[model samples]
Target: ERPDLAWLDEVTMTQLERNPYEVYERLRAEAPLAFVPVLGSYVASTAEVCREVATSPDFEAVITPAGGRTFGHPAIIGVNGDIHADLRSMVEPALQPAEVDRWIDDLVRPIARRYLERFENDGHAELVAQYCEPVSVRSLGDLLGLQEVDSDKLREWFAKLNRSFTNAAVDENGEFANPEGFAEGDQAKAEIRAVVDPLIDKWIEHPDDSAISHWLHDGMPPGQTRDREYIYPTIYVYLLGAMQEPGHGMASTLVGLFSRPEQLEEVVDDPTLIPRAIAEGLRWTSPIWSAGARISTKPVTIAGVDLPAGTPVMLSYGSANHDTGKYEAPSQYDLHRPPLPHLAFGAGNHACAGIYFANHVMRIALEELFEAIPNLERDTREGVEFWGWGFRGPTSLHVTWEV
Candidate 1:
């Protein structure tokens, strides 16, 4: 017998987009793995099931036709096995914890400070757009050797790419509910290639200490020469993966802290708690809500639900992070919760490769902001709102600090 589909009738895409936790709560209690007709995939809701889907050999990561169409080429996210390993290894040196630490004094901290200085004296600023985004884009851009490209342009490209990836809704027939977004995304891919292709050629001739350069020379396999198809698509993956999350994560963390002043005070008073706070923030509101679609290789059973071969599965990291089975009060943002690994960055080999760099960037971003701005307060006059199910975060974080 298959899992019950009755709950799906009660669930709508709007409900999932706005407050998915409520739906996830029902799913976790009733059916941990159930098919959502609208999403055209089965969602794995519980921590255990989500983990199994990510790590199980029964499921494959090679998201074909859709992956190539969305990204303009197959990226590391869309490959499996040794190919995935090799692609991840190519950029590992640039994104590792030690490499991130090496850039702290020179690159990360300075970028955070420069952005802070823009509105530090203004008493109030929209932190997400003004502070978080620039810091995120510039840091990743410098590391990827795209400093020559305008930060605003890079941000625009990322926005288009993200919208295309996340915002496209699917009908019951498994067709795009919004074709415009998909088209725009394809355009953005072309635009990104136009800019990055020349830079790749430049870096090839004049080797430099950049992530792209590392992927070009040092990270390449001993026997193989440069493959533009392989390198370019993966660069697009980094563009979306490396560039977007840190900023959204920063905004989400700030929202978590600002919502509970006592918790905010705890972290501010004891700066060491920043990392703990970041962890809680991520767990509380995962920046990347779903670990895109994974395909089942053959017939498999999850949470007692049987699935046929070639079934598409979406691992809900947001839901797994808030699984009541895992945490006592899953929704409450408590920094003191006994530390257990959360699926915010996902799990297994296909997990976020830039995890270390993301954490380092967030740690420094928060540290610098808290130190630079005193009496920082969320602007209650303008309400804060978090949106998106595929990729989620606060849309605008309005805040005021004592000048």
Candidate 2:
């Protein structure tokens, strides 16, 4: 469930829960490929090493289900080779640049405006729970073309999948992330399947304009063979994913603003630097950090560090984002950094296809917020805190605004 980095490599859950990127930055610089006896594994922070593990023939996408091991391949994400390649191609076309441009204007911008409009008079709002969550969820619903139900709850479901994976123990103190959890998760998953299935069937049979409808009804990569079981699960994956990474960047963007108020002021005044702002957000949080785990394909050396075959490696998304080797002033959050190649959506073959959609969605949402609430921030930090470890983010964001 957790990233099995070099056993006792010294980074802890609490350290990650606070700020993993910073911690990973240290590891990257000092011990780019340090072994941890605790995990019987090692952590790789340098971009080259991370990429090596990701692309190596020996590296396997690690799978340790929260509710024990599920019997089947869990659809997208945790697989490699032709199967992963097929799914990647399928989803890739679905998330086109033109498609993203259309959604930004139509779906995301308005939702952001609605939330920020509530706080326009007040001058502040907790962007995550208030603005980002709603925008992200609603846009996902629109992307999937679900005309009947609100998909915001779907965001909650997706967020749980991360918890189910990373923080699988329960009782807080890092015990069983889901102590009263395992059985409950299974039950909830079934319920989720029920809701998603029929809509998926409709899209499959009738073939409409949405992601669920397209993948099942038409198949992926324009011309390709389709598998019913595989296609159905793919839709299921995205429904939860609709809330996955963007939610992190959403909270991170807001936190970015709160931390650097002038950036928001510039965005508000310029009204044209939305892209730069969103890039800064992705860089700062990197969202999905050291997620899942990778089983080395064969004997390999990352960044010149020696490793036997079958080593489990943690590719630090956090470290890559903060790599001074790649980015100057990696620690500093700059809305003005040129050539900011962030690892927020990942890199290489596993690079998230939803990134284009996410970038367009967040950009327009921020634009809407600028139009609506010109000035927004926290009055006090009470009732506000960040959450998540493997997949980084704030669980609950609370701030009083001028309104």
Candidate 3:
């Protein structure tokens, strides 16, 4: 029998929006695999269950046409099997560690320094808006050959796409509860197409070193044509993700370090610990909380719960990262925790392709900021609040440093 989450009824979306950790904890403890009415899916909260649901053949990841309408149908995330493998193959090489490293000196660090220079002398600045946002947007923009678009405009489009997809509520029937959000998302999609369609035509005429160019010119397998349907939606996926994942990941890392001064001091003292800190920070507050909904291809049992075929299962990466069964003191942000893989990047074949790129960006972002302003301190007078369950991050990180 499915565990009762009747207590979840009293819990509102606003509460989940503010801090889902509490809700995730309760769900993990009581029912790791149970239907969440508010979310309209059976959320798999434990690390074990999430991995199984993600990797097992019994479950297939589903991307509803309604959900993909704004994001573009057949986007990389929405497809599976050969099409998914084909799409992943195209962009994976450019995002690999070796390839991403080539960008550090020429692209990543320079972008970080450029953004930091804007407020390095101000003594105080909101790192999220001032630093993290632009660095994320431009780093991805340059990689995708989208330097032609304004950073602010790119950021705006990302915001609309994220809000439309992640924030939109769905009823138990899997229909959108907020159509207005989708409308806004559709508009953003139109605007994005207006800008990118021309670039696609140009890239086709003359390819470059950019990821988009690589996808267009060299990403397809034998017997497969490089059509617009195959390319445009994937670019949309990159547009939505490339900015938020690293941007939110960077801000969340700062929040973790700032909240714990000793840990921050340790990282400041030994820069080698930066990578560990990044891993722990991502585990502590996974930017992408739920790794899309998956449907049970056939009847399956997960986390001791039996479900019929075609059940919609939402893999809660955020909750699994904090599962007590997975890590000791899972809620705490301790970089020294026993080294174990966390599902911040999901699991199996569907794992994040941008893993290397995101880590590189965070590393450079932190390295440049700290090297420039070692004494940077988080301002707690106003209090720091993290927002969003779908795409989480610090709302505003006010900080001060010596000029």
Candidate 4:
């Protein structure tokens, strides 16, 4: 019934659900500060204004009580102000550039090669199942000190958790969010707790270079104690968030490379260009386009639009990254685009802390995959496809190479 966006009436809810890039692109083009009653929020689609809203204190992370209680405590997404900063301080040091950089040669390289080896012998495989998914999950598990074999279980739990999180609320169409999926997500959390309970106990006694070890050896701040319930939420979300997005990050980059074979050959020829390609990959298509919605605690103004207090603002970092104002020829995926910054990893106090780790893992994964299978090409019988415009990536990239 939104007359302003009445044209969008043709776009079905399912279409909007799975692929909303066209909708976002249009919003960025004509209405930089439009309101769609369907979303119940003001859309910020330009990089300049997205950065402004994100960095501002007026628009805070809206972690509703329902979400907080679902995780049995306030997860990182639920906190704001100095309290949020305090929690971030506890984990940021361990995931700092220096710390994550140390793991490149020793951790990322070998892990990437190990996954590649699985299908190197077969000469043909589903890229997502064989290479992309495992490397990301295994790296996250290792960082958290979970046992090697437990990664599969961890992945399942993380997937179910996110599925429920997405369906937590009703859509613009007024359909009730999937109640069954919500219960499944709740069940998965218990499974995660069951699996990680032992690892946490082990880390308490035998410390490793992993995050669990760091938290155990160096205690959390006063308000945030080391008690089981207190630390569990952090561990749960950290493991899932650290792994899930990066998995798609690597896959989407590979999709970009494969889509433009010329770009792929160039990166393979000179490995140095791989980093730039990765950077372009991020801007071209961010893994998580529309992050969680934010509520304005106080009135704010941006792009000449005045927003009242208690306003709902949904920041589309993906849209902002591709705004023509921010990047030249915004649609073209140029690897050598000048030093313009994109909102793929986001901005402000809530920015992703594991950016270094995610990027390093993606870069190493690309190097090892191409190095092992030098003649890799898309399987004509099973064409490569990328979808899911929100948390987007290749649904599955089928490929083959000469053994």
lDDT of predicted model 2: 0.64
* Alpha carbon deviation, residue 17, candidate 1 (Å): 2.2
Task: Name every residue pair that clashes in candidate 4.
Answer: none
Clashing pairs for predicted structure model 3, backbone only: none
List ranges where model 2 is wrong by over 4 Å: 1-11, 21-23, 35-41, 57-74, 117-124, 168-184, 219-228, 381-384, 399-403
Q: Per-residue lDDT of 212-244 in model 4, one digit per residue for the tens?
A: 767656655533435666667777666556667
In the range 125-244, model 2's lDDT, one tens digit per residue, is 555767777778777777777645564576666666655555433232324433443454455467767777787656555777776666654544553436567765555556555466
C-alpha lDDT of candidate 1 relative to the true structure: 0.81
Off by over 4 Å in 1: 1-4, 64-68, 219-225
> Candidate 3's residue-wise lDDT over 47-90, tens digit each?
98898988998887675434466676668877788888788888
For lDDT, candidate 2 versus 4, the one ahead is 4
User: Number of backbone collisions per candidate, in order?
Assistant: 0, 23, 0, 0
The segments of candidate 3 whose C-alpha lies over 4 angstroms from its true place after superposition are 1-3, 64-66, 172-174, 219-225
What is the lDDT for 110 in model 2?
67
- Candidate 1 per-residue lDDT, tens place, 43-71, comes to 88999999998999899885433445676
What TM-score would every model get versus the actual structure? 0.95, 0.83, 0.95, 0.89
Backbone clash pairs for candidate 1 read none
Model 3 scores worst on lDDT over the 10 consecutive residues at: 63-72
Candidate lDDT (C-alpha), each: 0.81, 0.64, 0.81, 0.71
Candidate 1 to truth, TM: 0.95
